[PDB]
Amino acid sequence: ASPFRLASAGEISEVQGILRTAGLLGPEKRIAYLGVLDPARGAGSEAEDRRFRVFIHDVSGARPQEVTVSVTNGTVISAVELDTAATGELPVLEEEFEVVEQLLATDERWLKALAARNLDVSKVRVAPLSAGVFEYAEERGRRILRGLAFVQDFPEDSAWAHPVDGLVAYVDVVSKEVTRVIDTGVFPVPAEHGNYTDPELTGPLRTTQKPISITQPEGPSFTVTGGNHIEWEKWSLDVGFDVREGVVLHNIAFRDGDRLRPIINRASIAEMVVPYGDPSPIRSWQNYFDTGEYLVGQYANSLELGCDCLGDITYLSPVISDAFGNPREIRNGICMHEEDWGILAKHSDLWSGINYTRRNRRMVISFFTTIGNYDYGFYWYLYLDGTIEFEAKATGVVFTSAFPEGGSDNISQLAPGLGAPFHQHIFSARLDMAIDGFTNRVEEEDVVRQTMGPGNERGNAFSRKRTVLTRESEAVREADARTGRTWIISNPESKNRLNEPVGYKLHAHNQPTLLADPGSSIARRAAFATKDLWVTRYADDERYPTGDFVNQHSGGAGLPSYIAQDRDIDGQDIVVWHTFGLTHFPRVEDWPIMPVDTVGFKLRPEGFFDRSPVLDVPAN
């Protein structure tokens, strides 16, 4: 019954039928993106209109289309031809991954480059990398991927240990032509393998690790009804899944006594950018938007019990569409479990003689995705005390290059002759706020140091100041760790028993934002990543900080375009976009496969409750 249920196999089939019947899905067509649309503001219209948005690629070269279907009434609502030279190409198709390698295996420039290196073309793998927008005027309106090559000594060899430097090719995947091959020169191919399952590398495995058994003999404290509605320790929410964004949290709310109080209307990681800081022309174009360009949801892993998720695990298996409109199930694609989280509260009082201790717990919702050499885990946590936290776990295999003779300022050496360019992984959290409802405002809170003098005779005083962000034109904010800067999202029309607005505080990690020059191409296309915090007025079509079609878009779409409307945000339906990420200078310990590193953010209540919300937690 819930308009927020996961798409089913049946719904995607019905979308396939509707598109076919309408003549929109013939044999030369491909679904580049399919996803359910959220209900509009005001679901008072009884019975839901389950609508779906679709991007349809045309392999014969005709113009792509954006189509919206209503599977409830079984009709096409709208269909728009897209001009990709203006508004960006469609997301990369999975079936275009291999096209880059097979085209190059019969191009004479590529074979010439490999012959110069004594490389067997049947051992050379080519990574299908997104192209971006640079100084190649001929790439306008064309669907282009770029190729970087890695040698694979045998079918189970880790190709990342053998980068083929000085060589890159550009490929038109629709007309199937190799547009350019660039050969800046010969670099030795690093010969050491990086096979982390080879006993020569690993040595004998440890026998010292004894098991840890985490069980819940009575089962878990949460309940799933309606496929994806979660109730856990006063928390209530719906777990969605989008092939582009991955796991989406809807209707996050908290049962405060008898009233169900909204906190967040919709939470997602709406974009991901990985810019590389190597100035070598072989890689200076290299940036990936894994979310916008590749869609991280469609690369979700199946997570195995006792390996990926440990404990009493409840699984969800989301359904997505393949390139032809057939439903594809991602088995065990989402993990949900609760886990112990140490001491929640503790005091032993000298005067009353009472000793008090309570344990904390958190609810975990996670999925893991793989894009080429990179693996990323997305973790949402809910805590007993009302804290909401997001954590990204970055692992996998670092992207490699040759290590130049005589060193580099932008590459680190992991192995003889083997380099790993410097880069960042930068995320955009989109938080459609609904703190006790939709009348919200954002305040910037700074620590205030005070001077020794009258009224502060001992020089011990300090304070704070809050600055209300009133219009979008003033709501592009920078971190300031030195003054403890945080941001408070409050509802000015909902007060707690002390007559103050209820609120939640956003705690950032204050990592560096985008390091690229502000005149570069990537600063233009990843403009959200240049600032820590943006606030916009809610609007149905403003969904991604980079716009709808990120692939090969020239820049400026998304957030800097939304912000320019200078709308009123002081007590309105607002959206918070938080940029955060990792700056990765690769270390020897990241090789041949890298241990997890993390980054994220959290929100804690700030006078949302009338007292501590965990006074009713038992002792156990």
Angle at 52 between CA 329 and CA 40, to 5 degrees: 125
Place of tokens 């953010």: 601
Q: What does the DSSP 8-state code read for residue 47?
A: S
| Alpha carbon distance 186, 405 (integer Å) | 12
Minimum separation from the CB atom of position 165 to a second copy (A)? 17
CB of 399 to Cu ion, least distance (A): 8
Pick the binder of a second copy from 118, 122, 225, 620 (CB under 8 A): 620
Q: Binding site: which residues? A: 288-299, 371-376, 423, 425, 584
Among 76, 328, 523, 572, binds a second copy (CB under 8 A): 523
Kindly state whether residue 259 participates in binding a second copy, applying the rule CB under 8 A: no
CA distance 21 to 10: 16
Please identify which residue in 78, 484, 493, 561 interacts with a second copy, judged by CB under 8 A. 484
Residue nearest to Cu ion (CB): 584
Is the CB of 36 or the CB of 489 nearer to a second copy? Answer: 489
Question: Is 458 near a second copy (CB under 8 A)?
Answer: yes
Residue 77 amino acid letter: I
In the complex, minimum distance from the CB of residue 186 to a second copy, in angstroms, rounded to a whole number: 21
**What residues between 545 and 564 interact with a second copy by CB under 8 A?**
none
Spell out, one character per residue from 574 to 593, where the chain touches Cu ion: x when CB under 5 A holds, - when not: ----------x---------
Compute the distance between CA of residue 338 and CA of residue 220 in angstroms, rounded to an integer.
7
Binder of residue 368, out of a second copy, Cu ion, none (CB less than 5 to 8 A by kind):
a second copy
Q: How far is the CB of 264 from a second copy (least distance, A)?
A: 18
Does 427 sit near Cu ion (CB under 5 A)? no
Q: 150 vs 254, which CB is nearer to Cu ion?
A: 150
Q: Which residue's CB is nearer to Cu ion, number 15 or number 392? A: 392
Tell me the window of 136-144, 317-325, 537-545, 604-612 that interacts with a second copy (CB under 8 A): 604-612
Q: Site residues for a second copy, window 39-98 (CB under 8 A)?
A: 97
- Beta pairing partners, 365: 336, 380
186 versus 344: smaller Cβ distance to a second copy:
344
Binding mask 180-199 for a second copy (x = CB under 8 A): ----------------xx--
Q: Which stretch binds a second copy (CB under 8 A): 6-14, 110-118, 371-379, 535-543?
A: 371-379
* Nearest distance in Å: CB 49, a second copy: 35
Look at residue 353 and give the partner it binds from Cu ion, a second copy, none, a contact being a CB closer than 5 to 8 Å depending on partner kind.
a second copy
CA distance 427 to 270: 8
Counting Cα atoms < 13 Å in the Cβ hemisphere of 278 gives: 28
Q: Residue 562 belongs to what H/E stretch?
A: helix 559-563
Cβ distance 602 to 388 under 8 Å?
A: yes
Q: Which is nearer to Cu ion, 442 or 516 (CB)?
A: 516
Helix (H) or strand (E) holding 16: helix 9-21
**Which of 55, 170, 187, 276 forms a contact with a second copy (CB under 8 A)?**
276
CB of 574 to Cu ion, least distance (A): 31
Q: Per-residue x/- mask for a second copy, residues 145 to 184, rule CB under 8 A?
A: -------x--xxxxx-------------------------
Give the up-direction half-sphere exposure of residue 230: CA atoms within 13 A in the CB hemisphere. 28
- The position carrying tokens 């793998």 is 125
> Where in 287-316 is the site for a second copy (CB under 8 A)?
287, 301, 304, 306-308, 310-311
Q: Which residues are annotated as a binding site for Cu cation?
A: 423, 425, 584
Q: Which residues of 417-429 are buried (b: 16+ CB within 10 A; e: fewer)?
A: bbbbbbbbbbbbb
* DSSP-assigned letter for residue 40: P
What distances in angstroms separate CA 555 from CA 279, 521, 551, 578, one per listed residue?
21, 7, 10, 20
CA 473, CA 152: separation in Å to the nearest integer?
A: 52
Q: Which residues face 456 on adjacent strands?
A: 453
Catalytic site includes residue 290: yes
CA distance 189 to 201: 19
* 370 near a second copy, judged by CB under 8 A: yes
Closest approach, Cβ 533 to Cu ion, in A, equals 23
User: Site size for a second copy, by CB under 8 A?
Assistant: 151
> Which backbone phi and psi does 578 adopt, to 5 degrees?
-105, 120
**Can residue 531 be called a binding residue for Cu ion (CB under 5 A)?**
no
Catalytic residue chosen out of the listed positions 290, 432, 532, 573: 290
Tokens of 79: 């269909």
Q: Smallest distance from the beta carbon of 472 to a second copy, in angstroms?
A: 24
Residue 51 contacts Cu ion per CB under 5 A: no
Q: Give the H or E element holding residue 401.
A: strand 401-402
SS3 assignment, position 108: helix
For 169, the enclosing helix (H) or strand (E) is: strand 167-172
With CB under 8 A as the contact rule, which of the stretches 63-71, 80-88, 236-244, 585-593 interacts with a second copy? Answer: 585-593
- Residue 584's binding partner out of a second copy, Cu ion, none, with CB under 5 to 8 Å set by partner kind: Cu ion
Both tokens assigned to 71? 């599977």
Site size for Cu ion, by CB under 5 A? 1
Of the pair 158, 228, the CB lying nearest a second copy is at 158
* Least Å from the CB of residue 266 to a second copy: 24
Residues with Cβ < 8 Å from 430, sequence gap 6 or more? Answer: 266, 267, 268, 269, 270, 543, 544, 545, 575, 576, 577
CA atoms of 229 and 405, how far apart (whole Å): 57
Is 197 exposed, middle or buried, given 0-12, 13-18 or 19+ CB atoms closer than 10 A?
exposed
Distance CA(364)–CA(379), nearest Å, equals 7
122 near a second copy, judged by CB under 8 A: no
Binding residue for a second copy, selected from 38, 66, 96, 375, defined by CB under 8 A: 375
Query: Which one of 33, 170, 276, 374 is the catalytic residue?
Result: 374
List the single partner that 26 binds among Cu ion, a second copy, none, CB under 5 to 8 Å by kind: none
Is the bond preceding residue 199 a cis peptide, omega within 30 degrees? no
Residues making up the annotated binding site for substrate are 288-299, 371-376
Q: Give the HSE-up count for residue 7: Cα atoms under 13 Å, Cβ half-sphere.
A: 30
Nearer to a second copy, 175 or 598 (CB): 598
**Residues involved in catalysis:** 290, 374
Binding site for Cu ion (CB under 5 A): 584
